[model samples]
Target: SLQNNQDVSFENIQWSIDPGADLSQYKMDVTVIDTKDGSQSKLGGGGSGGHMGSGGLSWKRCAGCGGKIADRFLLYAMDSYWHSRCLKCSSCQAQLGDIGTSSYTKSGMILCRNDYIRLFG
Candidate 1:
């Protein structure tokens, strides 16, 4: 009979991230009855799309200040989120695009190429 065994739970895994990134690796650990002598499982994949929330609930949080974003306006730099105003160089308080200052984002914080080389290199 189908009730003869109950080993399907042992075969199921959870959502997970890959190695390397900071938030890498995880398992959802969910299972459902397949009604065919076994159970079904779900797996989470690794990605960088913040929360699936959209205004439906589509919002991105600013990493600099860590606040709820609105109006669909924000910055995605250095693999992180930031308010339009928060997107600035760590060395200089100059705002990009607005203040006419452009720079590179790396090592988690935005910085001018000169400052990046001077501080990092």
Candidate 2:
């Protein structure tokens, strides 16, 4: 017969960024339920697009600045995902295209399609 199991809660997990540590390393623990046996599976996938089942890579907002991101450029090991167009100029908020497209050093941060493959592939 089925018996009562220990109470399960989602409050045990904690999220935070370590000083001097890369931001991309943070991940939320996800639980997937098995339909066959009602068992739980833990998912430790990092970054949104890095997951095995995730679809094509796309730009996402920065967790730090909340500004629009135009490229998926990850600065460090912990910077999981970013927008390509969002990293704008601090003075004018203009979208930075890339090194080749503009003279500005920080105009755009678009990552080439090939680079995404090397990192997420």
Best by lDDT: 1
Instruction: Kindly list the per-residue Cα lDDT of model 1 for residues 14-115, writing each as its tens digit.
Output: 547433233212111111112221122332231233343334354556566666554224544545655546666788766542342345544555675456
In model 2, which range of ten residues has the least summed lDDT? 28-37
Writing each residue's lDDT as its tens digit, candidate 2 over 1-121 gives: 7798754665455556353133222221112212221122333333442445536344444543564343334232123332334333334444432321121221223223233223332
| Model 2 CA deviation exceeding 4 Å by range | 1-52, 55-61, 64-81, 98-121
All candidates' lDDT scores?
0.47, 0.33
Q: How many clashes does each candidate structure show, in the order listed?
A: 9, 17
TM-score, every prediction: 0.42, 0.21
- Please state the error at residue 31 of candidate 1 in Å: 38
- In model 1, the runs with Cα more than 4 Å from the true position are 1-58, 97-102, 105-107
- Which pairs clash (backbone N, Cα, C closer than 3 Å) in model 1? 14-28, 14-29, 15-28, 15-44, 53-57, 53-58, 54-57, 54-58, 55-58
